[PDB]
């Protein structure tokens with residue numbers, strides 16, 4: 001009784017951004033999000049173009065790009081359109097509502113102008129969502145709430161995770177899903193994206209902990225895997241991206257029946 | 258048995274950044290931090306120069322500055338040195354450790370190059386501190402941990418606040434204090450900075466809640482008030498800044514004895 005991505009795209013209460021994402025996931029047979037954690041625009045754009053066909057989403061940290069310009073994001077949008085993926089700026093908004101409005105819309109980055117999706121921490125209360133929504137809703141954008149984290153010592157557990165789910169439910173015109181390690185909402189309209197994913201077990205020296213695609217998608221019920229170093233540090237990023245795509249997509253299919 | 262700012266500056270376990278801050282607070286008789294939430298470099302630099310003598314710290318959001326350049330931060334450093342205040346970039350780092358390293362050091366903003374202090378959320382676990390420390394410690398910088406928030410619905414309460422205090426204790430070579438609404442640590446080496454401060458009662462429409470200087474400093478035991486709109490929206494920002502300085506400084510003095 002679990003709906004395919006394609007069916008989820010047609011759900012009555014689905015956000016237009018999620019519906020576009022779910023349709024291209026189904027069409028392209030990819031539930032992989034590339035975490036393009038690179039410091040040079042040329043590498044960001046070469047990864048986006050080569051791996052574009054293999055991904056449903058490209059997750060950015062534009063505040064690490066040494067040569068950021070708006071023209072770089074224009075070229076990135078051209079590739080997102082060509083290859084059909086969404087752009088997700090992983091900014092983790094977590095300030096008071098009044099402040100996040102200007103961070104999302106303005107400054108040098110003008111995130112709301114090119115980011116299909118942003119994410120936000122729920123620790124400040126619902127004002128963080130309300131502030132972002134004042135910019136994002138008129139621009140037809142979506143937001144993800146951070147309901148759990150993959151890093152050691154995370155405090156996003158128990159009642160904190162529950163607060164994030166309730167917050168999402170109550171703001172469904174803008175909040176389209178979660179960053180979590182597992183399915184945290186029983187409503188199929190919400191997307192679940194899981195970072196801290198690698199084919200092999202382990203972590204890093206700065207608190208990151210990894211789980212496999214089959215575990216996160218197949219057993220823990222998430223929709224999309226967010227993968228950075230497992231792809232970016234490989235020699236052949238395209239075959240690495242294809243390996244992760246096949247793992248996550250088959251895990252999804254075997255969960256469907 | 259409460260030590261003056263001047264004495265706290267000499268405590269054996271005090272961080273060099275906190276000691277410099279505590280000395281200038283004492284010398285200038287100001288425990289006021291100006292939240293310079295403006296979008297134009299000219300207004301940021303005109304506020305820093307005119308209110309510099311009245312402040313112990315200028316808190317920035319460089320990601321809302323429409324015309325940010327590194328030369329703007331050079332001119333801001335010239336004013337911080339001239340007038341003797343610290344610069345605090347209110348970035349609220351809250352990502353995995355590996356990611357925050359590059360956000361703090363690199364990108365367009367090169368925050369670590371000009372920010373005496375940054376702050377960080379504790380929700381990801383201690384990896385956020387460890388990541389920032391790898392850049393900040395070699396540069397002799399300090400970090401503040403967000404132990405409580407002033408916004409409605411905040412989840413930074415109870416065991417979350419306690420986790421932030423423990424995290425600070427265990428990283429005292431880099432963590433110099435807290436963003437909180439009250440004294441949360443009994444160790445005088447740590448600084449307590451409190452936002453959500455205005456002379457009059459009220460809030461905003463996006464979740465902000467205000468308390469007075471006398472309440473935050475005098476009754477709740479914080480060290481420094483962080484004030485934005487109560488100064489920036491006033492016609493005469495200098496007299497507004499002087500009003501807040503006198504409130505916070507007298508409240509401190511009456512707490513001493």
Ligand SMILES: O=c1ccn([C@@H]2O[C@H](COP(=O)(O)O)[C@@H](O)[C@H]2S)c(=O)[nH]1
Nearest residue numbers: 035149150195196227228229352353356
């Ligand atoms: O809870 C989270 C939330 C976000 N991320 C992001 O996902 C990417 C993973 O990068 P990787 O380890 O190289 O695969 C990084 O950009 C970080 S901030 C997490 O990791 N955990």
Ligand SMILES: O=c1ccn([C@@H]2O[C@H](COP(=O)(O)O)[C@@H](O)[C@H]2S)c(=O)[nH]1
Nearest residue numbers: 095096099292406407452453484485486
């Ligand atoms: O828990 C917090 C942490 C930080 N701040 C920041 O302090 C400033 C207050 O701005 P004001 O309302 O205009 O005085 C803003 O930049 C916000 S992000 C809080 O408010 N609460």
